[PDB]
Amino acid sequence: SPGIWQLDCTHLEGKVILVAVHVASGYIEAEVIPAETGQETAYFLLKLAGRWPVKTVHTDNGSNFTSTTVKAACWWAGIKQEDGIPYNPQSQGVIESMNKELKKIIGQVRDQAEHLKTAVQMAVFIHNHKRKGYSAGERIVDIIATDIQT
Ligand X SMILES: NCCCCCC(=O)N[C@H]1Cc2ccccc2[C@@H]1Cc1ccc2c(c1C(=O)O)OCO2
Interface residues with a copy of itself (CB under 8 A) are 29, 43, 46-47, 49-53, 76-77, 112, 117-118, 121-122, 124-125, 128-129, 134, 137-138, 141-142, 144-146, 148
Rounded to a whole number of angstroms, the minimum distance from the CB of residue 109 to ligand X is 9
**Could you give the dihedral angle defined by the CA atoms of residues 109, 43, 93 and 3, in that order, rounded to the nearest 10 degrees?**
-110
Interface residue with ligand X, options 14, 34, 87, 115 (CB under 6 A): 115
Which residues, 26 to 45, sit near ligand X by CB under 6 A?
Answer: 39, 42-43
DSSP state of 131: B
Q: Does 113 bind ligand X (CB under 6 A)?
A: yes
For residues 80 and 53, the answer to whether their CB atoms sit within 8 Å is no
Which residues, 41 to 100, sit near ligand X by CB under 6 A?
Answer: 42-43, 46, 69, 72-73, 76
* Burial (CB count <10 Å: 0-12, 13-18, 19+), residue 39: middle
Q: What is the 3-state secondary structure (H, E, C) of 30-66?
A: EEEECCCCHHHHHHHHHHHHHHCCCCEEECCCHHHHH
Instruction: Count the Cβ atoms, other than its own, within 10 Å of residue 2.
Output: 19
Question: 61 vs 121, which CB is nearer to a copy of itself?
Answer: 121
108 binds, among a copy of itself, ligand X, none (CB under 5 to 8 A by kind): none
Rounded to a whole number of angstroms, the minimum distance from the CB of residue 70 to ligand X is 9
Q: Round to whole Å and give the CA distance between 106 and 55.
A: 29
Point out which residues bind ligand X (CB under 6 A): 39, 42-43, 46, 69, 72-73, 76, 111-115, 117-118
